[PDB]
């Protein structure tokens, strides 16, 4: 569009696309940028479980049409002052993805459907946090997916869905039962006045029996936070009644 390159300042509350959306006067590109900027997960509670839901436009794959409108506009854009061969390469690369409109709509709605179907089998709340360590995603791999996705619909098999659901349910129930064991033991120790009792041992056993944690690595402040939060939970009824006996 002939605009001067953006001098983006890190830590800006707005993202580069959020700036470009209000700095660009072309309707196709600006509308695509607006959708991208305000495209986030929507939180919904379904059957008592928090879910991260997608925008219906991407669930049905319609936003790919706006993406291709923007890409076509860019492809027929003038690109002032850019060397001509590089400009042609860029705009033919744009057309490479633009001419895959139907395939990319199919890819988007396939991805959305498989995400929905596999998310129906999640039992714990899908809490969204920025993790310490991130999974690396290769834009080359994304390109390969976009340029090689075909015409065959692949969906989870019913046995695969039931297996995923059983694994999630087993992990969730084990988590709750180990919480109950830890809370019962901690409460019993405090009620019997075992002052020479290290609740760090109980928390270590809890994390160990969760089976996904390398307990030797958990930081110390987090171990003590876990102890503090376990000390505050009410005891389960059966365990408490046995303790009362």
């Amino acid at each position: 569009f002939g605009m001067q390159r953006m001098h983006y300042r890190n830590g800006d509350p707005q993202t580069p696309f959020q700036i470009a959306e209000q700095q660009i006067q072309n309707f196709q590109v600006a509308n695509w940028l607006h959708f991208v900027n305000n495209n986030y997960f929507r939180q919904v509670v379904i059957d008592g479980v928090l879910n991260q839901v997608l925008n219906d436009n991407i669930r049905n794959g319609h936003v790919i049409n706006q993406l291709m409108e923007a890409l076509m506009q860019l492809s027929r854009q003038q690109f002032p002052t850019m060397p001509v061969d590089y400009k042609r390469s860029i705009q033919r690369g744009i057309l490479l993805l633009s001419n895959r409109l139907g395939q990319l709509v199919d890819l988007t709605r396939l991805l959305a459907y498989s995400y929905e179907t596999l998310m129906a089998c999640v039992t714990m709340n899908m809490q969204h946090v920025q993790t310490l360590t991130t999974e690396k995603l290769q834009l080359t791999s994304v390109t390969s997916l976009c340029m090689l996705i075909g015409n065959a619909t692949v969906i989870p098999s019913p046995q695969t869905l039931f297996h995923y659901y059983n694994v999630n349910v087993n992990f969730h129930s084990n988590y709750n039962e180990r919480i109950n064991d830890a809370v019962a033991i901690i409460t019993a120790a405090n009620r019997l006045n075992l002052y020479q009792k290290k609740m760090k041992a109980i928390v270590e056993d809890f994390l160990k029996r969760l089976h996904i944690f390398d307990v030797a690595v958990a930081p110390d402040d987090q171990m003590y936070r876990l102890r503090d939060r376990l000390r505050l939970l009410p005891v389960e009824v059966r365990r408490l009644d046995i303790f009362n006996l």
Binding site: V63, N65, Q66, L101
Partner: protein
């Protein structure tokens, strides 16, 4: 008719919903319907007019489908859509007018214009959309031979009738007993007068009755009843019944005695109200019977005693009355009311394009004559033209 309504509905929704900036999800279904309409109409040719001064216009349809690949509609999309919508609205308006300006004694409910005849074909049934409007709903019900109902605010149900009946009379018109009345639109104002003030009447009571039959059965009607005919309570000079002479009416208003309003259906009393004024309800009826009495007051102060002597020279004339107004009602057949503009639309189109008087409707669509002789063929033609008028008003403000 249903196809014409669907064209109007689709165009109206196109104008209302295909607006710059709106999400395509708001108009996805509307665009599907619009493209279906374009596909169905493309390649067909129509002719409208040729009657009176209505110009003969030829219509051809070759339009591209509206785009479907867009997240939010923009200026180009709306301009492209409006270019097609304007032509379609013009065509629908001409079809509606050409249908309204035509009538037939037999088969009056069938399409009369060549364009609507053509749209009656099966190839066009794909454009049907949703028949939600009241008039199209009743059109479909009448086509299926079901019960229909139109809701009217002040239905124009009473043929205009301003008259009087003299039960006691003489050439001099100085000792008269009788009734006056005006029935117009939804108001019946009736008065009963006695010049003697029932001096010689049995029990000093004069009975008055007034029967108003309606050409259609009204149901679920709310009526205001008041105890005075305000229109017949001032001095009047009235032409005699045969027009030979004129007589004088100097009323003095007394309260109506033993008021009774009966709403009857096929001669059976359905509702009866005695000495109740204000808002009343008639659930089902085709005739109204208002009965009241002039009772000479038994006790009178000197002024009233002076007013009412017991001898011939009656200078004041005792008068009682009732005023009845149908504020709202429901009727199976289409009537004219004080809130809808369908009668006005039909009459205006006919007058503007100077349509020669046909065989069904009266000259100038005179509603008085229409309701006075609301025969079944007139009912069919009137329902057709009113439905077309509503379809047109859907698009033309």
């Amino acid at each position: 008719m249903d196809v014409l309504y669907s064209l109007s509905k689709t165009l109206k929704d196109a104008r209302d919903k295909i607006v710059e900036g709106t999400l395509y999800s708001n108009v996805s279904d509307l665009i599907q319907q619009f493209n279906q309409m374009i596909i169905t109409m493309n390649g067909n040719e129509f002719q409208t007019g040729g009657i009176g001064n209505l110009p003969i216009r030829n219509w051809n349809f070759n339009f591209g489908l509206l785009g479907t690949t867009l997240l939010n509609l923009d200026a180009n999309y709306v301009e492209t859509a409006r270019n097609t919508i304007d032509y379609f609205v013009d065509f629908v308006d001409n079809v509606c007018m050409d249908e309204m300006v035509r009538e037939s004694q037999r088969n009056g409910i069938a399409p009369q214009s060549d364009s609507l005849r053509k749209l009656s074909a099966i190839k066009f049934k794909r454009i049907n959309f949703d028949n939600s409007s009241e008039y199209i709903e009743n059109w479909n019900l009448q086509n299926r031979r079901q019960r229909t109902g139109f809701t009217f605010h002040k239905p124009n149900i009473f043929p205009y009738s301003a008259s009087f009946t003299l039960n006691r009379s003489q050439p001099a018109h100085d000792n008269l007993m009788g009734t006056m009345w005006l029935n117009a639109g939804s108001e019946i104002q009736v008065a009963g007068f006695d010049y003697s003030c029932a001096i010689n009447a049995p029990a000093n009571i004069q009975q008055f009755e007034h029967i108003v039959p309606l050409r259609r059965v009204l149901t679920t009607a709310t009526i205001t009843l008041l105890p005075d005919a305000e229109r017949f309570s001032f001095p009047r000079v009235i032409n005699s019944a045969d027009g030979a002479t004129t007589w004088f009416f100097n009323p003095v208003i007394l309260r109506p005695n033993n008021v009774e309003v009966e709403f009857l259906l096929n001669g059976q009393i359905i509702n009866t109200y005695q000495a109740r004024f204000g808002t009343i309800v008639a659930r089902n009826f085709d005739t109204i019977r208002l009965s009241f009495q002039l009772m000479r007051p038994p006790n009178m102060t000197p002024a009233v005693a002076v007013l009412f002597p017991n001898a011939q020279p009656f200078e004041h004339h005792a008068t009682v009355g009732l005023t009845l107004r149908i504020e709202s009602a429901v009727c199976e057949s289409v009537l004219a009311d004080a809130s809808e503009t369908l009668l006005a639309n039909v009459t205006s189109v006919r007058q503007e394009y100077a349509i020669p008087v046909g065989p069904v409707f009266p000259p100038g669509m005179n509603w008085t004559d229409l309701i006075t002789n609301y025969s079944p063929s007139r009912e069919d033609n009137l329902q057709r033209v009113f439905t077309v008028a509503s379809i047109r008003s859907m698009l033309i403000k």
